[PDB]
Swiss-Prot record, chain A:
UniProt protein name: Interleukin-17F
Interval of the full protein contained in this chain: 38 to 163 of 163
Protein family (similarity comment): Belongs to the IL-17 family.
GO CC annotation terms, alphabetical: extracellular region; extracellular space
GO process terms (BP): adaptive immune response; cartilage development; defense response to Gram-negative bacterium; defense response to Gram-positive bacterium; inflammatory response; innate immune response; interleukin-17-mediated signaling pathway; negative regulation of angiogenesis
Length: 126, 122
């Protein structure tokens, strides 16, 4: 069984659709990060704002590491270290149909949120 | 942001004011691609806590905590003149409400610390 499955003893609903209640729980929260984190980082990154009007959130910001290496104390690239992305799974809502027939469906989006500086690994399988 | 979830006023009323949530997760087959042991190989390493809530989808939400205030140098030592700082992302999860046949779902905002980065202090 899955999370969205209603108990088997319950009467069936036409279309197999579920009730989505109004309002987003804890909507008032906002991300709090160090000022200019993406630029002050030794593994700096750039952002790409992706837009979809039939997706909630409509704007999904994607990060991309600026360099292969990490930035040293002198402000130069160090290729002995690697800037690597941090990717996280998220849920967005896809808006379907139109007007009175509007329905919603969950969608999994992989978001690259930022980069970190790692010591490289020599992989056993290339 | 309510408008995305609304219908024109003239639409036939749905008792309970609930919206239609269709079955299935779009692009559920996707898997996170990240460097192996990223959290401990990072110069701003972090710990993970697997938060669990059986009324939440996904039930498991992994939260990161920076292991140090400073960053780790080539020698494996902490340099407290650099800062390990958390990277935070806004996500949506689904909360299950009520019991039995009266079960409904509600969106919920969750702030996720995904890892840490090393920054030069200001
Ligand atoms: C990160 O996690 C480690 C555990 O892997 C924590 O280190 C342990 O902390 C507990 C605290 O109860 C101690 O009893 C252990 O002896 C510690 N073990 C090691 C190997 O250090 C550590 O506290 C965590 N770091 C932060 C900053 O939360
Ligand atoms: C982002 O990329 C551009 C090139 O498209 C580059 O000029 C810039 O320095 C990068 N970083 C920031 C913070 O804009």
């Amino acid at each position: 069984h899955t999370f969205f499955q209603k108990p088997e003893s319950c009467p069936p609903v036409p279309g197999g659709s579920m009730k989505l209640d109004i309002g987003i729980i804890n909507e008032n929260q906002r991300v709090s990060m160090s000022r200019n984190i993406e630029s002050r980082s030794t593994s700096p990154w750039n952002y790409t704002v992706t837009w979809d009007p039939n997706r909630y959130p409509s704007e999904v910001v994607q990060a991309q590491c600026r360099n292969l290496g990490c930035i040293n104390a002198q402000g130069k690239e160090d290729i002995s270290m690697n800037s690597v992305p941090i990717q996280q799974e998220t849920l967005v809502v896809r808006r379907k149909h139109q007007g009175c027939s509007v329905s919603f469906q969950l969608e999994k989006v992989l978001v690259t949120v930022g980069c970190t500086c790692v010591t490289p690994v020599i992989h056993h399988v290339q």
